[PDB]
């Protein structure tokens, strides 16, 4: 929509979003099996992290 709306500058202008665009994020995959194997509590993990 934002691309097609910039091709009609004769009856429409300044077509833009108001929010924000996608940003990089950091995913931490908590392997559950290894967490149980090593004998750590998942609650401990999430609590420490947060």
């Amino acid at each position: 929509l934002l691309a097609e709306a910039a091709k009609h500058p004769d009856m429409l202008t300044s077509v833009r979003p108001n929010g924000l665009e996608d940003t990089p994020q950091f995913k931490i995959d908590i392997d559950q099996e290894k967490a149980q194997a090593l004998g750590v509590s998942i609650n401990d993990i999430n609590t420490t992290l947060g």
């Binding site: 559950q32 099996e33 149980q36 194997a37």
Partner: protein
């Protein structure tokens, strides 16, 4: 994952229970002309707004 056997085995949720996209409650079944259907019963706030 539910538990890990010292054998080295693995006990998944699918191995003890059916996983199924169901409903919250199964008490309510609606039929239009016999044919299975759903619907919306609309009440009226005390203070119509006719």
């Amino acid at each position: 994952l539910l538990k890990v056997n010292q054998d080295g085995s693995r006990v998944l949720l699918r191995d003890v229970a059916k996983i199924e996209l169901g409903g919250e409650n199964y008490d309510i079944i609606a039929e239009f002309n016999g044919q299975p259907a759903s619907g919306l019963g609309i009440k009226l706030a005390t203070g119509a707004n006719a």
